[PDB]
């Protein structure tokens, strides 16, 4: 049997643990699917590349408003797919070849599960091919997998998820999306901008439900006029028809289209590990960790989607950095170990219009007993908004009345994930709304003026 | 004769002086040209509206690179001008009616000059129509006007400036621009993106002379391959040809095109006032002011292009705010007066590629005896750059080696005037490079990641 000092399950953020302080340790790396994890191959990187091409075509479509007459000749979808994954696919292969060609690193390209704990305290791990080995320390970075409602699985009908939809053979003409979360908004924007008709089936009444009240309402109303919304509807049946899909809904409604995309959330992969037998406490399928990314089993760490309350790459990378440090400390010397920082986690939805958020919503601050100052700033009230002829963009800021402390910011409009970064910075370092507005210059007539004027109109 | 407590020359930033603390004072407002100043009518606001429409045509032109085949049918220049100035002209009119319709405000639509000082210390002012009045306090906000080299004036040939080119009858096919400043770059981007051929005549070797060495160099080579660059050449003669222009150069070379634009700097309008006669010291044509926006004459303030070392609207507005406060104190009570803050002044050039900067250049920091860390970060080395297929965008950051203090930042690339705002904030509030890089989250995979990785690569 092979002996290892460390074992890492998952090559997403889990691939970022190894640094100079680990050379000289024999480590085992386990990857079920493609090397590099979800973000690089079927997540953040390819999706946003698809979003950019979509927004380029959206620009051509609405060019007449600015006095430029244009039209779209052809959408070379095969060339779009090939250009994107033509740069991604070699990276996963070369990145796998970098670990394989290391003398101290052994790569196991199989699904790995926890075996029984050995007498000496080490952990046994076995793959689906029956290859076993031991390791003194283990990191669980197994990520998550898409959740599919039971009725679609029971009907055995062919479907798409985020993991398959980006490599469809050719662009469909009508696409149903079940669900209305981050994945649904982005992929509805991508395909509709490329000409596809879109139908959304959501069990609720609104899109991006957990966003701020103002954003959720306004975003849903805008979406309703460009995509077909079937509110308050679950799928209870589905079947094929030639090359089309039919969706039977809970009220007897039907939805017929060429393909279906299921965007109904994801599920942590902590249940596919035999974790609880080895002392790794599970909350349903989520690995439980403390403030140090430590599980309940000794010398076992977890990070990322498999354990974090956030399904975000910039959180998973920070959690891996915590694990990278805490693996080189004694398991019980907690005060030489570093804690995870979830204090001001931001997020963005690369849909149309783009959305970005950090901190508390308005309702969250009132429900926590805050005396709030609030402002909603239209893009159209600022010079850069004039050049855009913008009528829907907004930035909403919530602040405490006493100190001027920044409590939340939520943007729906052009460059949302960009112009929110100063608000992220101010919150993370205790900058007040007064200081941020007038203790620094804002370039005229650049877009950040919309944030500046939002701070000045806090009432 | 009419008596006034305050007199304001210029309705640009000078129109933003009047505030609640001024109701109850008889005010005289003098505007030679159009109400609102240069920025609103012939500057920042109208120009950037043209930059956005140009970038839409840019998007259509290079759309096949992203897999969308499109093309431009026609450029409705008449509709562009009408849409832009269709919103601007009513704003200048309505804003003029707001001051006119005030009982305490009297508007004089003529060129106003300083008369001899009256015995009581009051100031006499006369218009071009010969109407006189007195005022106890005066602000000079006369701005600036373009400088034209002698040979173009001597040749009596028709020319354009920033004040006229934006309302031209029809788009030329070829346009000469003399000079290589902010106005030259922006207007070169505007018209070339709309199909016009561009020729630049500059007496130097570079196009963005006062920018950072790296930015100035790289921007020039990019310009040389898309616009025709006439290095180290002055214009010594010019004459007509049908409806075309011919430009004779100092080495006997010629440049033939449809129209000419002079972007050869601006000159403060302090010489059109008889200022020195009333004790207003002038530096050539610039009114001199101290750290309190006070001139050398008693009860006379200055702000904007007429006195500031910066021709920037966000500086002109802050100086007007300084004047707004200091006007309500005794002329000698300097310790109750506020000082203007010219620290960390930012600027941006809305060209292609866009440029934005704040703080010192690399050369400036070494000349100040700084042990510097430096980094140049490619957009293409960051996930958002992949979605752009970006090969030219860069971010340059200079920091002190000891403390990590941020000394300067310079961006050439997409959304430059946006993604620089966090660096402005950090410098204005003493955030170090270490805290800024890892004391806060950055949204993955948003454009600000290019700034984050620049801080991490300070070497
Ligand atoms: C469509 C989509 C778009 C997204 N867009 C964004 C975005 O714009 N911004 C953002 O911040 N986040 C985004 N996310 C979220 C982000 O991708 C995740 O938070 C991130 O991938 C989590 O990283 P991880 O390493 O924890 O998981 P993963 O990257 O999924 O790593 C888990 C890896 O381990 C493998 N594995 C699992 N179990 C085993 C096992 N037992 N044995 C061996 N190997 C195993 C898996 O196959 C996988 O390769 C997106 C997610 C999706 C699905
Ligand atoms: C083409 C161009 C583009 C620019 N783009 C930007 C940009 O993107 N961002 C930015 O921050 N800055 C920009 N600027 C600079 C900005 O426009 C100026 O810094 C700003 O206008 C300064 O305001 P002001 O009130 O000092 O001058 P002005 O706005 O020019 O105010 C002076 C006014 O007073 C009048 N006046 C002058 N002398 C007299 C007199 N003797 N009697 C009576 N009336 C008089 C003038 O007619 C004018 O209306 C740009 C400038 C130009 C030329
Ligand atoms: N740019 C980004 O940051 C980005 C992009 C993509 C994904 N992500 C992350 O990836 C994760 C997954 O995204 P997601 O959009 O799939 O999930 P999500 O954001 O959690 O939204 C899930 C959606 O699916 C619906 N749904 C769930 N179960 C359902 C069922 N059984 N029947 C019908 N509808 C059902 C939900 O309805 P209810 O709300 O009523 O339950 C909701 O509309 C999230 O954590 C998200 O933040 C991030
Ligand atoms: N977005 C913005 O912030 C923005 C936009 C437009 C303008 N502005 C400001 O407005 C002001 C005016 O802009 P500008 O472009 O007119 O001036 P500028 O930016 O100061 O540049 C002036 C240019 O004219 C050239 N020049 C001067 N005298 C010349 C001569 N006799 N013959 C030939 N070339 C000559 C200069 O060459 P040398 O360098 O060798 O002197 C330089 O290239 C500046 O202060 C600028 O910052 C700001």
CATH number at residue A432: 3.30.390.30
B442 in Cβ contact with A420 (< 8 Å): no
Count CA within 13 A, CB hemisphere, residue B437: 16
Distance, CA of A341 to CA of B378 (rounded, Å): 29
- As annotated, the active-site residues of A are 444
Asked if B21 and B133 sit in the same domain, the reply is yes
Question: Does residue B345 sit within a domain?
Answer: no
Asked if A6 and A103 sit in the same domain, the reply is yes
Asked if B85 and B163 sit in the same domain, the reply is no
Return the number of other C-beta atoms located less than 10 Å from residue B5's C-beta.
Answer: 16
Q: How many angstroms does the Cα of residue B359 sit away from the middle of ligand 2?
A: 24
What are the C-alpha distances in Å from B174 to residues A67, B153, B188, B194, B261? 20, 21, 11, 11, 11
Distance from CA of A69 to the nearest CA of B (A): 5
Asked if A54 and A140 sit in the same domain, the reply is yes
Q: Which of B48, B386, B441 sits opposite A445 (nearest CB)?
A: B48
Distance, CA of A72 to CA of A56 (rounded, Å): 11
Instruction: Kindly report the three-state secondary structure assignment for every residue of chain A.
Output: CEEEEEEEECCCHHHHCCCHHHCCCCEEEECCCCCCHHHHHHCHHHHHHHHHHHHHHHHHHCHHHHCEEEEEEEECHHHHHHHHHHHHHHHHHHHHHHHHCCCCEEEECCCEEEEEECCCCCEEEEECCCCEEEEEEEEECCCEEECCCHHHHHCCCCCECHHHHCCCCCCCCEEEEECCCHHHHHHHHHHHHCCCEEEEECCCCCCCCCCCHHHHHHHHHHHHCCCEEECCCCEEEEEEECCEEEEEECCCCEEEECEEEECCCEEECCCCCCCHHHCCCEECCEECCCCCCECCCCCEEECHHHCCCCCCHHHHHHHHHHHHHHCCCCCCCHHHCCCCCCCCCEEEECCCCCEEEEECCHHHHHHCCCCEEEEEEEHHHCHHHHHHCCCCCEEEEEEECCCCEEEEEEEECCCHHHHCHHHHHHHHCCCEHHHHHHCCCCCCCCCCHHHHHHHHCCC
Structure tokens at B458: 């300070």
Q: For residue A193, what is the domain's CATH number? A: 3.50.50.60
Structure tokens at B291: 């750290």
Q: Beta B300-302 vs A266-268: how paired, if at all?
A: unpaired
Return the number of other C-beta atoms located less than 10 Å from residue B33's C-beta.
Answer: 17
Question: Does residue A192 sit within a domain?
Answer: yes
Asked if B135 and B276 sit in the same domain, the reply is yes
Ligand in nearest proximity to the CA of B32: 2
Resolution (A): 2.3
Largest CA distance in chain A: 76
Distance, CA of A157 to CA of A159 (rounded, Å): 6
Distance, CA of B294 to CA of B86 (rounded, Å): 38
> Which of B359, B301, B317, B314 shows the shortest CA–CA distance to B135?
B301
Structure tokens at B361: 């250049």
Q: How many angstroms does the Cα of residue A137 sit away from the middle of ligand 2?
A: 67
Give ∠ CA A240-A242-A247 in degrees, rounded to 5. Answer: 30
Number of domains in chain A: 3
Say yes or no for a CB contact (<8 Å) between B67 and A59. no
B443, B448, B456, best to mutate vs chain A, most A CBs in 10 Å? B443
Distance, CA of A423 to CA of A439 (rounded, Å): 14
Asked if A12 and A138 sit in the same domain, the reply is yes
Phi/psi for A9 (5° steps) reads: -100, 110
Say yes or no for a CB contact (<8 Å) between A315 and B441. yes
Q: How many angstroms does the Cα of residue A75 sit away from the middle of ligand 2?
A: 46
Phi/psi for A88 (5° steps) reads: -80, -45
Residue A417: cis peptide before it, omega within 30 degrees of 0? no
> Which of B316, B387, B426 shows the shortest CA–CA distance to B36?
B316
Asked if A226 and A288 sit in the same domain, the reply is no
**Which residue among A336, A370, A393 closes a domain?**
A336
B180 in Cβ contact with B208 (< 8 Å): yes
**Which residue among B232, B264, B296 closes a domain?**
B264
Phi/psi for A344 (5° steps) reads: -140, 70
Residue A386: cis peptide before it, omega within 30 degrees of 0? no
Say yes or no for a CB contact (<8 Å) between A67 and B83. yes
Question: Does residue A234 sit within a domain?
Answer: yes
B409, B445, B449, B455, best to mutate vs chain A, most A CBs in 10 Å? B445
Question: Does residue B332 sit within a domain?
Answer: yes
| A60 Cβ under 8 Å from any chain B Cβ | yes
Asked if B162 and B208 sit in the same domain, the reply is yes
- Is residue B267 in contact with ligand 2, taking CB distance under 6 Å? no
B151 in Cβ contact with B159 (< 8 Å): no
Q: How many angstroms does the Cα of residue A216 sit away from the middle of ligand 3?
A: 14
Report the residue of chain B nearest A60, measured CA to CA. B60
Largest CA distance in chain B: 76
Asked if B26 and B134 sit in the same domain, the reply is yes
Angle between helices A213-224 and A182-193 (to 10 degrees): 30
**Which residue among B284, B309, B336 closes a domain?**
B336
Report the residue of chain B nearest A75, measured CA to CA. B68
B245 in Cβ contact with B176 (< 8 Å): yes
> Which of A446, A456, A457 shows the shortest CA–CA distance to A388?
A446
Give ∠ CA B266-B267-B271 in degrees, rounded to 5. Answer: 160
Distance, CA of B95 to CA of B35 (rounded, Å): 7
Question: Does residue A345 sit within a domain?
Answer: no
Distance from CA of B136 to the nearest CA of A (A): 30
Instruction: Kindly report the three-state secondary structure assignment for every residue of chain B.
Output: CEEEEEEEECCCHHHHCCCHHHCCCCEEEECCCCCCHHHHHHCHHHHHHHHHHHHHHHHHHCHHHHCEEEEEEEECHHHHHHHHHHHHHHHHHHHHHHHHCCCCEEEECCCEEEEEECCCCCEEEEECCCCEEEEEEEEECCCEEECCCHHHHHCCCCCECCCCHHHCCCCCCEEEEECCCHHHHHHHHHHHHCCCEEEEECCCCCCCCCCCHHHHHHHHHHHHCCCEEECCCCEEEEEEECCEEEEEECCCCEEEECEEEECCCEEECHHHCCCHHHCCCEECCEECCCCCCECCCCCEEECHHHCCCCCCHHHHHHHHHHHHHHCCCCCCCHHHCCCCCCCCCEEEECCCCCEEEEECCHHHHHHCCCCEEEEEEEHHHCHHHHHHCCCCCEEEEEEECCCCEEEEEEEECCCHHHHCHHHHHHHHCCCEHHHHHHCCCCCCCCCCHHHHHHHHCCC
Sequence-separated (6 or more) residues with CB below 8 Å from residue A95: A11, A15, A35, A36
Angle between helices A77-100 and A44-61 (to 10 degrees): 160
Among A8, A28, A37, name the best residue to mutate to test ligand 1's pocket (greatest count of ligand atoms within 8 A of Cβ): A37
Distance, CA of A434 to CA of A443 (rounded, Å): 18
Q: Beta A27-30 vs A105-108: how paired, if at all?
A: parallel
- Is residue B359 in contact with ligand 2, taking CB distance under 6 Å? no
Angle between helices A421-428 and B421-428 (to 10 degrees): 30
Structure tokens at B225: 């391959």
Phi/psi for A120 (5° steps) reads: -70, 5
Asked if B14 and B134 sit in the same domain, the reply is yes
> Which of B198, B177, B188, B167 shows the shortest CA–CA distance to B42?
B167
Asked if A332 and A375 sit in the same domain, the reply is no
Say yes or no for a CB contact (<8 Å) between A56 and B63. yes
Q: Is B201 annotated as a binding residue?
A: no
Say yes or no for a CB contact (<8 Å) between B67 and A45. no
> Which of A365, A363, A360, A359 shows the shortest CA–CA distance to A344?
A359
Sequence-separated (6 or more) residues with CB below 8 Å from residue B340: B291, B292, B293, B318, B319, B322
- Is residue A31 in contact with ligand 3, taking CB distance under 6 Å? no
Length of chain B: 459
Asked if B180 and B128 sit in the same domain, the reply is no
Experimental technique, in short, is X-ray
Tokens 């109303």 -> residue: A221
What part of B 408-447 touches A (C-beta under 8 Å)? 415, 417-422, 424-426, 428-429, 431, 435-436, 439-447
Question: Does residue B441 sit within a domain?
Answer: yes
B372 in Cβ contact with B402 (< 8 Å): no
Distance from CA of A122 to the nearest CA of B (A): 34
What are the C-alpha distances in Å from B272 to residues B245, B276, B326, B453? 32, 11, 25, 51
Q: Is B183 annotated as a binding residue?
A: yes
Q: Which of B70, B83, B436 sits opposite A72 (nearest CB)?
A: B70
Q: Which residues of A touch B60 (CB under 8 A)?
A: 59-60, 63, 68, 70
Q: Which of A56, A60, A345 sits opposite B441 (nearest CB)?
A: A345
> Which of A361, A343, A342 shows the shortest CA–CA distance to A410?
A361
Residue B440 belongs to what domain range? 353-456
B198 in Cβ contact with B179 (< 8 Å): no
Distance, CA of A148 to CA of A162 (rounded, Å): 12
Distance, CA of A378 to CA of A215 (rounded, Å): 13
Report the residue of chain A nearest B436, measured CA to CA. A425
Distance, CA of B210 to CA of B361 (rounded, Å): 9
Structure tokens at A254: 């039907």
B227 in Cβ contact with B188 (< 8 Å): yes
Structure tokens at B288: 């001199």
> Which of A315, B395, A459, A449 shows the shortest CA–CA distance to A440?
A449
Phi-psi region of B389 (alpha: psi -120 to 50; beta: other; left: phi over 0): left
Structure tokens at A320: 């891996």
Structure tokens at A145: 């997998």
A73 in Cβ contact with B69 (< 8 Å): yes
A447 in Cβ contact with A415 (< 8 Å): yes
Among A142, A191, A322, A416, name the best residue to mutate to test ligand 1's pocket (greatest count of ligand atoms within 8 A of Cβ): A142
Distance, CA of B394 to CA of B215 (rounded, Å): 9
Question: Does residue B346 sit within a domain?
Answer: no
Residue A353: cis peptide before it, omega within 30 degrees of 0? yes
> Which of B315, B306, B308 shows the shortest CA–CA distance to B273?
B306
Count CA within 13 A, CB hemisphere, residue B55: 17
Distance, CA of B432 to CA of B372 (rounded, Å): 13
Structure tokens at A159: 């479907």
- Is residue A181 in contact with ligand 3, taking CB distance under 6 Å? yes
Residue A445: cis peptide before it, omega within 30 degrees of 0? yes
Question: Does residue A341 sit within a domain?
Answer: no
Return the number of other C-beta atoms located less than 10 Å from residue B354's C-beta.
Answer: 24
Distance, CA of B3 to CA of B122 (rounded, Å): 9
What are the C-alpha distances in Å from B46 to residues B19, B74, B164? 26, 21, 12
Distance, CA of A169 to CA of B215 (rounded, Å): 43
| Number of CB pairs, chain A paired with chain B, less than 8 A apart | 227
Distance, CA of A401 to CA of B380 (rounded, Å): 43
């Amino acid at each position: 049997m092979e002996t290892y000092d460390l074992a890492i399950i998952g090559t997403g953020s889990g691939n970022s643990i190894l640094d100079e302080r680990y050379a000289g340790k024999r480590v085992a790396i386990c990857e079920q699917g493609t090397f590099g994890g979800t973000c690089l191959n079927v997540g953040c990187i390819p999706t946003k590349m698809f979003v950019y091409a979509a927004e380029v075509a959206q620009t051509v479509r609405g060019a007449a408003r600015y006095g430029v007459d244009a039209h779209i000749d052809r959408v070379r979808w095969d060339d779009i797919v090939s250009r994107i994954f033509g740069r991604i696919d070699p990276i996963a292969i070369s990145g796998e070849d970098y670990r394989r060609s290391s003398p101290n690193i052994d790569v196991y390209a199989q699904h790995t599960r926890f075996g029984p704990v050995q007498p000496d305290g080490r952990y046994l791990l076995r793959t689906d091919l029956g290859d076993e080995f031991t390791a003194e320390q283990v990191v669980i970075a197994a990520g998550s997998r898409p959740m599919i409602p039971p009725a679609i699985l029971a009907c055995g009908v062919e479907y798409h998820t985020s993991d398959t939809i980006m490599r469809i053979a050719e662009l469909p003409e009508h696409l149903v999306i079940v669900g209305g979360g981050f994945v649904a908004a982005e992929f509805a924007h991508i395909f509709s901008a490329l000409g596809v008709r879109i139908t959304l089936v959501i069990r609720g009444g609104t899109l991006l439900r957990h966003a701020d009240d103002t954003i959720c309402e306004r975003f849903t109303r805008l979406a309703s006029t460009k995509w077909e919304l079937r509110s308050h509807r679950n799928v209870v049946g589905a079947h094929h028809k030639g090359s089309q899909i039919v969706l039977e809904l809970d009220d007897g409604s039907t939805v017929r289209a060429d393909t279906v995309l299921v965007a109904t959330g994801r599920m942590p992969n902590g249940d596919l590990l035999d974790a609880e037998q080895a002392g790794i406490d599970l909350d349903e399928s989520r690995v439980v960790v403390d403030e140090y990314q430590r599980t309940c089993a000794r010398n076992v760490f977890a990070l990322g989607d498999v354990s974090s309350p956030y399904e975000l790459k910039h959180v998973a990378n920070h959690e891996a950095r915590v694990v990278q440090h805490n693996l080189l400390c004694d398991w019980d010397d907690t005060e030489s170990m570093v804690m995870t920082d979830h204090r001001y986690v931001p997020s963005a939805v690369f849909t149309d219009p783009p959305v970005a958020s950090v901190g508390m919503t308005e309702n969250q601050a009132v429900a926590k007993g805050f005396d709030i100052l609030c402002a909603i700033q239209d893009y159209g009230d600022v010079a850069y908004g004039w050049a855009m002829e913008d009528t829907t963009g907004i930035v909403k800021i919530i602040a405490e009345r006493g100190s001027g402390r920044l409590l939340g910011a939520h943007i729906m409009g052009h460059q949302a994930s960009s112009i929110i970064q100063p608000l992220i910075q101010a919150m993370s370092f205790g900058l007040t709304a007064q200081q941020m507005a007038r203790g620094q210059y804002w370039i005229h007539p650049a877009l950040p003026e919309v944030v500046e004027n939002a701070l000045l109109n806090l009432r």
